[PDB]
Amino acid sequence: TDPMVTLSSILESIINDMRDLPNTYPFHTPVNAKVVKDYYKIITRPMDLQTLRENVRKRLYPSREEFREHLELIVKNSATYNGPKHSLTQISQSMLDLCDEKLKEKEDKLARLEKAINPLLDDDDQVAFSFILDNIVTQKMMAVPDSWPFHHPVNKKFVPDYYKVIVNPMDLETIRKNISKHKYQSRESFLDDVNLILANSVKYNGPESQYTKTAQEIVNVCYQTLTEYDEHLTQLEKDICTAKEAALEEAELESL
Ligand SMILES: C=CCCn1cc(-c2cc(C(=O)N3CCOCC3)cc3c2ncn3C)c2cc[nH]c2c1=O
Numbered sequence: 001t002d003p004m005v006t007l008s009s010i011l012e013s014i015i016n017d018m019r020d021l022p023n024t025y026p027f028h029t030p031v032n033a034k035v036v037k038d039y040y041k042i043i044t045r046p047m048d049l050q051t052l053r054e055n056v057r058k059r060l061y062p063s064r065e066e067f068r069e070h071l072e073l074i075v076k077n078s079a080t081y082n083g084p085k086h087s088l089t090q091i092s093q094s095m096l097d098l099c100d101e102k103l104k105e106k107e108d109k110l111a112r113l114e115k116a117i118n119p120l121l122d123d124d125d126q127v128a129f130s131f132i133l134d135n136i137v138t139q140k141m142m143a144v145p146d147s148w149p150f151h152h153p154v155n156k157k158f159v160p161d162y163y164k165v166i167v168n169p170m171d172l173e174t175i176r177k178n179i180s181k182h183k184y185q186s187r188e189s190f191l192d193d194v195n196l197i198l199a200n201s202v203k204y205n206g207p208e209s210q211y212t213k214t215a216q217e218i219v220n221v222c223y224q225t226l227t228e229y230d231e232h233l234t235q236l237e238k239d240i241c242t243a244k245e246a247a248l249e250e251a252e253l254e255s256l
Pocket of ligand 1: 148149150151152153154155156158159170171201204205211
């Protein structure tokens, strides 16, 4: 018995429910780029319900968040293309609302499957690694003076052109959300996102901007603290690696 099939089937059942909701049809299939010739030129990350279903069946989504993140892309894309208040964006939001409803109704089962699919989400070493990361963000990085601009995602309302320039946005709240979801099994991925903050400030504000001087201070204090914790983190990453390999040993052995 394989929990990924059960999970994928739950998501597929939700896709079916959203397709059956009223007025959702313009999103059921990929945009026909041969009729609407500029579509993939405005939206960079196309998404639709057929490709989403195809990804669910290829088992690419091991948890609520990857599926929901791809689902939420549809709404952001309509908001971008149709406008933030277009009825279509409102209809894509109506499907997301039903989705949030189903995830809420079935949340205990979903938790059980998500943990069976990926046991690291219960590994005392993964949780501790994530806890340490969270403290670096809150106790060191968010304490940099005048670091408030990086605490939350940019609101396009206040910086109207930001996301036309920055295609890989990042912020400290998003990283914390990622930590809470245990996205990071090691310092490499964590630092990829951390360094992305500094790179983005350089691009949008310029190398000599005060925003970038603050971002340099944020990254520097992140590295200083990682260096201070090197030996414990190396041990945690090692135990995480071993748990991850055993979660294959005991995962695919069952598919037979
Ligand atoms: C991911 C980090 C990008 C860093 N960043 C931020 C801003 C910035 C963001 C927001 C904003 O959207 N806010 C507030 C914080 O909470 C969410 C809502 C508001 C702002 C801002 N500057 C003045 N105000 C009033 C800005 C402006 C010019 N360059 C930048 C810049 O590089």
